[model samples]
Structure formats: structure tokens, C-alpha cells
Target: QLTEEQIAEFKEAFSLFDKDGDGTITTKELGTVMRSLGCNPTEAELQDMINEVDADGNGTINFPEFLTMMARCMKDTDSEEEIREAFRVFDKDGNGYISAAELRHVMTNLGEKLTDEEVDEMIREADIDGDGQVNYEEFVQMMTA
Candidate 1:
């Protein structure tokens, strides 16, 4: 299992999938999400990835499933493998940016309790352009904090 610190990071990274900040994402758009972070995945890889996690699979991916994906997706790297690999999940269709809704989504699902106001406020500060687009740097900031 990853440290709580590492686990927390995955939540925010996972948040990118959700346009509504709903906290859980289905097994869609994952390949495109993975590609932008510098990992190329075969289609089969996702199925195996989905089926193998310790998480109970019903085609929906939540925090635990997402973490196991992080563990499985990165099998043989050290240093920052978890960081970059876990970072692979989100980004709103591989454009390398996320939104306010996406930011709150994982927090709502992956970890414990949270307030919409704090997450909403944090996402705004996380975005560099002050647009809806929050970059990977902002993502990192959100995770680390």
C-alpha cells in the first residue's frame, strides 16, 4: 500500500475525470488520459488494469480502484513512478489541464470528507491562467498540499 501522502495525491489526480466533481469515474477515456502523461497503453492493458485491481469492479472506478491502478500501472519504476503514473489518470481528455469540477471530484470520492467551498476555492487558486484550465503544476500543488 502507498503512504497516505501518496494516496492523497491520487485522489486529486483522479479528480480530473469528473466534469461534475462527482468523485468517481467510469472506465472511459482512460487511454487518452494515460497517453498524455508519457505512457502508451495497449487497449488490452486497460482491461487487465481494470480487472486486476483489488478494488471491486463494476465498471466504475473509484479511489481504491484508482490507487490499485496506480500500483499496477507502474510496476517497475522507482523515484517518481507513482508520482507520474498516478498523475496519468486525469487531465480532461489529455489536454494536460483540469477544471474546478474535476478537482473536487476525487476528493469527494477518494478520501474522506470535504467541503465544496474549500475545494472550489483551492481549484481556483490552483489554476494558473485563472481560466478553467488548471495545469499539471497546479495538480501537483493540489496533491502535495
Candidate 2:
């Protein structure tokens, strides 16, 4: 249940969508967040039916509802698509490979730490072919391993 890092990521996304600074979101906005979380319309509608409230044009929800929806969907699904999308995001250049630079950049930004040795070791374990980077197959195998 150590999901704080995931929640940190989710909070970043939640604040990004809560553009009006009103601490709530329209179902329309929630749709965007849900897709990013790898949720499809059918599963999302369940939350829509339960937590949605009257609205000016669409349903609305607060942070807790948004968090609940995310947690619930995460609980139900095995997270295959979500894991792949994270790999997609990790491929910062859309180059179909995760380079040491990109990996190092993300790690430093997330923690304000700088260490190439650490990054290289991380890449080494996952860079199955020793190509000095990671392809989806390598990454997927490492993730499941």
C-alpha cells in the first residue's frame, strides 16, 4: 500500500486538469484523466453513476471522488495498458527506446538528486541487449521480472 509516489503523480495530473483552481472537475475533464489512467468508458461510467452530481452541462466531482475513481479502477484492472503508457511517457523522445539520459533526467527531476552511476546501473540491469538503452520488450520483461 505504499502508493504515495503514484499519488504524487496523480496529484500532479489532477492539479493539471483542475485548471480553474476550483478544486473540482467536470465529467468531461474526468474523461481525459481517466483515459490517461487507461480507463475505458464502460468502467468509468460506474463511478459516474455513483459520485456524479447535478451540473451546468456535465457531471462534476471533487478530489476525493477523483481519487476514489482512480483507486477503484486500479483495483479492478490488472494495469497492463497503464504500465505500457508509463513506458510511452518514459520514452521522452518518442524514439521507441528509453535512453540513459531520459532515465537520468526523470530520476533527478523526481527527487532533486544527481547520479549517473545510479542511472547507469538502472539501465544496465534492464538493457537486455547491451544496446545502452531499453526497448519495450526489455522493459516489459524487466518490469514483470
Candidate 3:
């Protein structure tokens, strides 16, 4: 488990990625920011990343979605602690859950913006059970698998 401080730092990082403060990050926004950070990700790469997390098909990446991405990306690193810490950060509300608005806020800090339509699309794609929302467990299952 991640300490509260570690979770806070991760939350700060998540806020940086969620450009719009809507609690979700979109592929376009994530791509632009990642590219600026020297990632140079193609649309397909971004799409694959999205497909891995955006379980609701809303075109937006919620906190869980982003956290799963972080986890998977860092799984090969020798720092499970860091990965858990990052997960804590992404779970901004400390409710053990990540919401779309939370994701947007994080992305806004990262210097990207997402349209409402994009967010809606992401939700449509990911919310398989029609819960109109996704939580950490679901996110982890999708991301890890």
C-alpha cells in the first residue's frame, strides 16, 4: 500500500495529466502532453493505451483508467512501491475510486483539454456494465489484463 504522502504526490502528478479538470483524460490530450514530454506516441499507440483502460468507451480516461496505464507501464520497473504510490495519487478523492471529472482536472494541469464529446465517447466504451461509472477494481482488471 502507498503512504498518504505518496498518494498525494501521485494525485499531483495525475492532476498534471488531467488538463481539463473534468476528471478524465482523452487520447488527444494524453498524446499531446506525452509528445511534449518526448513520448512521440502515435495514434495507434495512444488508442491501444486507451483500449486498455477506457472500459466505458467514453473516449475519456478516468482516474482508474490512467492509474491502470501507470501500473502497466511501470510493472517492469523494480519499484512496486512507486507504482502503488502512483495509484494512490491517481485516486484523488481517497475513496479508492477515480472519476471522470477528477481525470479532467488532472489533465488540465498537464496542459491539455478534452471535449465533452470525447469524454462521453470514452464512457460509452468503458462502462461495460452500464453503471455509468467505473471504479478502481474494474480499471485494474482491464488495465492489467
Ranking by TM-score: 2, 1, 3
Predicted candidate 3, C-alpha RMSD: 19.9
Judging by TM-score, tell me the better candidate of 1 and 2: 2
Best by TM-score, which number? 2
Give residue 20's error in model 1 in angstroms.
2.0
Point out where model 1 deviates above 4 Å: 36-38, 54-57, 76-145
TM-score of 1: 0.42
In model 1, which range of ten residues has the least summed lDDT?
A: 76-85
Instruction: Note the clash tally of each candidate.
Output: 1, 0, 45
Q: What TM-scores do the predictions have?
A: 0.42, 0.45, 0.39
Which of the predicted structures, 1 or 2, would earn the higher lDDT when compared with the native?
Answer: 2
Error of 1 at 115 (Å): 68
Tell me the whole-model lDDT of each prediction, alpha carbons only: 0.65, 0.78, 0.61
Worst 10 residues of 3 by lDDT: 71-80
Per-residue alpha-carbon lDDT of candidate 3 for residues 20-85, written as tens digits (9 for 90 to 100) = 788877766666544543345457767887786776777776666655555544443334455456
